[PDB]
Symmetry: none
Subunit: 202 residues, 2 copies
């Protein structure tokens, strides 16, 4: 069977034209029920112009659930193709909006049970876990995100434990030697002392 | 049973009022052979008014060898008494002069086998050694020194190990609870983020 990308429809929170909350995971739906047979592709550039992971779930019914994490405030450009052809209204230009005051976050770092206060590196040890606790109690209802730029150039969404008392815990261990950037945002915006530049060594 | 402090003679590199290099230990000699019987005392005030230890070796022949460490830039005041009476030209005012660039020194902290980067404090555990390594390779020809202000009210010279590759290791264990100030200088001047304020707890 053929495909007809002009019949593909997009909807849902992750494409909201009025903007989306930065720091919150979001979903949107792609409906290709009238579009024939083809692969759905989704490519996202983040506000710093870098690629961002788009998770595509095929619902087995002609529809797809697409999820991404807008960690940083700004414009996300989402290019969507079906069967190799760009769908109507792609590329989508989605504005992740900040709320709250990231600058009210307080950060404490711990290594091996030793508290460092708001301080990390410059040098850290491969294989040694760092624990970064962010106190967002005063900052607003949004979340803390942690994005790590590794020496090979990848970008990692580090899991952030939400304790539900306005605090967040970040556990990260550097596995390879070289330079890392640990970017910690609240509601889309850097918290104080973010980003942490560090060098991981034996 | 008497003494005459006016007959005591003093001389030597640690009394060089033209100037001495900060960060380097120095000695001087006291000749009390013509001064009768009495106890020799030497008080040293650093340029901020804090007492510094003067080590007095009684040579058993009416002479004494005295040493001290001028860790900080500025004028030291050296009060010398024999039999409780001040000797001539006391107090001696000895200017320790800075050299080099302490801003080029780099700090690494280690506690309990864990490297903590440049991060010292806010809290440390009583009886747990801290190792502070200062990389002074780019700072010039002088030495790193360390003084600790103890909750005692006392002001201690902490011995610094010179590795002769441009780095220096400071080992320090807080013996008692309370607030400590750890001052680290190079060639008389604070390295970056000195002084370090830490609280020792159980």
């Amino acid at each position: 069977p053929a495909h007809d990308a002009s019949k593909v429809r997009a909807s849902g929170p992750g494409l909201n034209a009025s903007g989306i909350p930065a720091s919150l995971p979001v979903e949107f739906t792609i409906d290709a029920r009238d579009a024939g047979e083809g692969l759905l592709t989704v490519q996202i550039l983040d506000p710093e112009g870098k690629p961002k992971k788009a998770n595509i779930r095929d619902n087995g019914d002609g529809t797809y659930t697409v999820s991404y994490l807008p960690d940083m405030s700004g414009r996300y450009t989402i290019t969507i193709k079906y069967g190799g052809d760009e769908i109507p209204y792609s590329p989508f230009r989605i504005h992740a909006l900040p709320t709250g005051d990231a600058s009210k976050c307080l950060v404490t770092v711990s290594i091996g049970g030793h508290g460092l206060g708001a301080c990390l590196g410059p040098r850290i040890q491969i294989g040694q876990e760092t624990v970064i606790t962010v106190d967002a109690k005063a900052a607003g209802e949004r979340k803390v995100t942690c994005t790590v730029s590794t020496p090979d150039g990848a970008e990692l969404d580090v899991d952030v434990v939400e304790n539900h008392d306005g605090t967040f815990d970040i556990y990260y261990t550097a596995p390879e030697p070289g330079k890392y950037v640990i970017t910690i945002r609240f509601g889309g915006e850097h918290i104080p002392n973010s980003p942490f530049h560090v060098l991981a060594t034996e």
